[PDB]
Every structure is written in C-alpha cells, then in structure tokens.
Symmetry: C2
Subunit: 79 residues, 2 copies
Amino acid sequence: ANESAKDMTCQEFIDLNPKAMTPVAWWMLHEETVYKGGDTVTLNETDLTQIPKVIEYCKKNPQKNLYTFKNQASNDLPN
Amino acid sequence: ANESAKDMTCQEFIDLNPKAMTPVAWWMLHEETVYKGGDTVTLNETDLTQIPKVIEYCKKNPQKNLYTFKNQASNDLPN
C-alpha cells in the first residue's frame, strides 16, 4: 500500500484506470481537505471545468508531478 | 475518461495502482454526495481503520462491486 497518489507522475496518471482517475482528480484538486467556510463539498462549476484540465495538463506535460496541479486551482474554499 | 469508479469490480480494484487505490478507498467510504452539518470528511480514525479493511474485503470477495463496501459503513456524518 501507499505507492503515493501525491507522487504519481503525469505519465503514470494518464496510464492508471479511467474508473479511478475521477476520485484521484478531486483528491488532488481539493488536496485531501477537511473543507472550510461550510460543508458544501459538492462539485462547483470551476471544479467541473478543472476535472478535464488536470488530465489534459498531464498528457501535455508527462514529466510533472500529479499534485502540483493544485497550485493553479481556486475551487471555492476560503483562506 | 468516464469509466465507472462506482462499478469497478473487486478483481479490477485489487489490480488498479496502489497510488490511486487510496483516493478510491476514501471516495467509496464518502460518496460524491454533500455533507450533513459537520467536518468529518477528513481521514478520521474510523476511515483510517476502514481503508485497509475494504481492500481486504475485495481480495477475499473478488466478485463484489467496490462501492457495495459503502453500505456497511455509517461514517459519512458527524458524531
């Protein structure tokens, strides 16, 4: 266990099963959070737009880490 | 994309990468639904205890649907 989704490389992300790619995408994009400002853990329209972009941006850059794709994304949550 | 994390068979789950198995094991313990007046969406100690047990339930019962292992687990609310 714990081969590390946060250390999965982008070439490996685009090669994992497309069933389990969907949970991986939000786990990363919302960075395993406890959720702040409320409990509205639903997919937001930014999130729904980013689910394809976190895949495209990996096949476009196969050398990158999977979890650094959080740095671009705002989601909805407060600082 | 758009393969069924919600219908990954248990023989297919124990064959997915141990990197992305971790997101799927939470995702199944806490569905794409919305929360019920709390913050226990974290990898709390019940979830940390269930994440290995649901992997063990798939390799011992490889015919089951991975998401059946939610129906046993009353963890997706505050207590």
